[PDB]
Design a protein around this ligand. Structure first.
Ligand code: NA
Ligand code: NA
Lengths: 103, 101
């Protein structure tokens, strides 16, 4: 779990347009694997592989509930792993804010 | 040039690679010659040209001829929107995009 390993696996995960779309779909709340597979014109096993890549990179969490795997966005992990680089290269356009604190 | 969705896709395939992210980070300090970029990595000159051509094709660097030498500049506005719209959409609480001052 070394943070350049975590950056690298996060960048490989968001390299793929299907995986980006799965992450956007999860921003509204937890979705079952079957619901995610229902939204894409590729095979269920191809969606399983995409979801395994996202889970491998810490970008989604998994939970079981009967015969169903439900996926949740891990937005804090994504923000740190991609957002440190992006705010480092684009300091005048992109701000990372992990802090709970607000004005 | 391309639709925003295609500029987004090409930026994400460019920043997929750790050598390309390191090049973009190195360019943060100002324009560098191809040869200087190549000297910052233990990989072949043809491999650095290939990485630079991928960054150029995604609009994340711009190229300039000064006599016989190619110089590269970071295109930070392009990178910020192509990657930052998605990242601020998925992480609204943690990531703020401002294209403007
Ligand atoms: Na979440
Ligand atoms: Na620039």
């Amino acid at each position: 779990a070394l943070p350049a390993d975590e950056e690298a696996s996060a960048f490989r995960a968001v390299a793929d347009p299907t995986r980006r779309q799965i992450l956007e779909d999860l921003r509204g709340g937890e979705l079952a694997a079957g619901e995610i597979a229902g939204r894409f014109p590729i095979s269920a096993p191809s969606i399983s592989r995409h979801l395994g890549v996202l889970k491998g990179a810490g970008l989604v969490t998994e939970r079981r509930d009967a015969n169903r795997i439900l996926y949740s966005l891990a937005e804090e992990r994504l923000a740190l792993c991609v957002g440190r680089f992006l705010s480092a290269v684009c300091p005048e356009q992109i701000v990372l804010r992990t802090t709970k604190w607000r004005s």
